[model samples]
Target: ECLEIFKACNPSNDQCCKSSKLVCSRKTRWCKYQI
Candidate 1:
């Protein structure tokens, strides 16, 4: 579910969190699969 959001946001093959500017944080509902 979460992964799909990341993938959808990031289609350039860049790191999902880093490239998408989605503000990933363990404190929130962020994914652990970081680059």
Candidate 2:
């Protein structure tokens, strides 16, 4: 996937991980396996 766990993510920009199993954590602003 484009972004994996622990990767930086900007949810404000509608950015998200490619993998459906991943999530863009708003609290941490990072892509993680789950919240």
Candidate 3:
């Protein structure tokens, strides 16, 4: 869900976070990814 949002925002993961200016906390909801 959030990942899709990130991708739609940008091509690179780093750019997505930076361009959007989102405070991606390492806590939980900010970055809940699957391995």
Model 1 has an lDDT value of 0.39
lDDT against the true structure, each candidate: 0.39, 0.61, 0.37
Off by over 4 Å in 2: 11-15
Cα misplacement distance, residue 16 of candidate 3 (Å): 6.1
- What C-alpha root-mean-square deviation, in Å, does candidate 3 show against the real structure? 8.4
* Tens-digit lDDT track of model 3 for 1-35: 34432243323453234334443334333432333
Which clashing pairs does model 1 show?
Answer: none
The candidate with the higher lDDT, 1 or 3, is 1
Q: By lDDT, rank the candidates, best first.
A: 2, 1, 3
Candidate 2 colliding pairs: none
Q: Residue-wise lDDT of candidate 2 within 1-35, one digit each (tens)?
A: 56566777755554665666766645466666653
What tens-digit string does per-residue lDDT give for candidate 1 at 1-35?
34433343333442344433443344234433435
Clashes of each: 0, 0, 0
Candidate 1, residue 27: CA error in Å?
Answer: 5.6
